[PDB]
Amino acid sequence: VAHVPDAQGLVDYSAQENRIWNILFERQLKLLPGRACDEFLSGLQTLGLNSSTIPQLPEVSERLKAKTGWQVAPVAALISAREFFELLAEKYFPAATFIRSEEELDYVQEPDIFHELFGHCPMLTDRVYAEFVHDYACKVLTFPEQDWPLLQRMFWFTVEFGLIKTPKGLRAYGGGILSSISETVYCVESDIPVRILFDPVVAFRMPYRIDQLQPVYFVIDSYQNLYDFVLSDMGKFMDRARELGELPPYFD
C-alpha cells in the first residue's frame, strides 16, 4: 500500500523504505555494465536516480518530460490493465508509491516504485522508444478487450523482456529484466533460453509464464523495429497469428 502525495507531489518516505531502495539500487547498478543497453544507461543518468533515497516524482517527471514529453503519475498499488494503458496513452508512466518489503526483495509479482522508476522509465528517455510505447498504448484502444491478451503478450516480449542485438553484442532493454538481478544476468549469459529474431507474428504466437525466468526472449536490432511494427496494422499480424496456431510452451 501506497503513500498519498502532498499538495506539491512530495512523499514522506522514511529510512527503512529508503534502505531497501538503496539495497535494490546498489546491487542492480553493479550488474548493468555489460548487460543493459546504452539507452538505459544514459536514461538512468538523465533521470537523476540517486542510490540513496526513493526519488520524488516531480523532479523525475520534469526530467523525463524535457527528453520526450513523458511524465510520471503517482498511483495506488493495484491498478487495472485498462488504467495502465489509459495513462500510457496520455504519455504518463504510472508509479505506485510503495516499495517492496525486506522479505520480498529478490522476486516480486506486484510491481513497485523500483520496478517502475528504475526498470522502465529510463528507456522512456529515448525518443523512438518513447514514441513506440505511446503509440502502442494508444492503439490498444481501437482494440476490444478480446484482443488485449495477445496485445499484452507482445508487450511482455518487448517493453518487459526484450533484448537488442547491438554492434557490441546482445543487451537488454526490457524493464522487467533490468529491475531484477536474476533476469539481468541470465538474459544475456545463460545457455538455457531460446533467443528468437523479433518478428510480430511469432511473438503473437508465443505463450508465456509470469513467475519464472523467461525461457524465450525476442531480439530486436533497433528500436525502429518496434516503431515500424506499430505504424503497421496490428490486427492483421494478430489474425494470422491466430490462423497459424499458438506454439507449444518451452516452459511448464
Residue numbers in the entry: 8 to 259
Q: Which text from the study accompanies this structure?
A:
PAH is the enzyme that catalyzes the hydroxylation of l-phenylalanine (l-Phe) to l-tyrosine (l-Tyr) using non-heme Fe(II) and tetrahydrobiopterin (BH4) as cofactors, and dioxygen as additional substrate. In mammals, PAH has a major catabolic role and its dysfunction is associated to deleterious hyperphenylalaninemia and phenylketonuria, whereas as we have recently shown L. pneumophila PAH (lpPAH) has an important role in the growth of the bacterium in media deficient in l-Tyr and in the synthesis of a brownish pigment called pyomelanin. Similarly to all other PAHs, the activity of lpPAH is totally dependent upon a non-heme ferrous ion, but – in contrast to all other studied PAHs which are iron-bound tetramers (eukaryotes) or monomers (bacteria) – lpPAH is isolated as an iron-free (apo) homodimer when expressed recombinantly. Molecular and enzyme kinetic characterization has shown that lpPAH is well suited for catalysis at human body temperature, revealing a maximum activity around 40 °C and very high specific activity compared to other eukaryote and prokaryote PAHs.
The best crystal diffracted to 2.5 Å and in the observed electron density maps the dimeric lpPAH structure is clearly defined, in particular for chains A and B. Thus, the current model gives good insight into the lpPAH structure. The catalytic domain of other non-heme iron- and BH4-dependent aromatic amino acid hydroxylases (AAAHs) has a mixed α/β fold, also found for the reported lpPAH structure. In agreement with the dimeric nature of lpPAH in solution there are two dimers in the asymmetric unit, formed by either chains A and D or chains B and C. Here there are strong ionic interactions (<4 Å) involving Asp198A-Arg247D, Asp228A-Lys172D, Arg247A-Asp198D and Lys172A-Asp228D. In addition to the ionic interactions, which appear to seal the lpPAH dimer together, the interacting interface is composed of the β-strands Val201-Arg202-Ile203-Leu204-Phe205 and Val223-Tyr224-Phe225-Val226-Ile227 from each subunit, and the adjacent hydrophobic C-terminal coils (Glu251-Asp259) where the two Tyr257 residues establish an important stacking interaction. In lpPAH (chain A) a water molecule is found at the similar position as Fe(II) in other PAHs in the metal-bound holo-form. From the observed electron density it is clearly a solvent molecule and not a metal ion, in agreement with lpPAH being isolated as an apoenzyme. One striking feature in lpPAH is an extended aromatic cluster protruding from the conserved active site residues Phe91, Phe92 (Leu in hPAH), Phe100, Phe139 (Tyr in cp, cv, hPAH) and Phe162. In lpPAH the cluster is extended by residues Tyr143 (Tyr in cp, cvPAH), Phe205 (Phe in cp, cvPAH), Phe211, Phe236 and Phe244, and enclosed by Pro207.
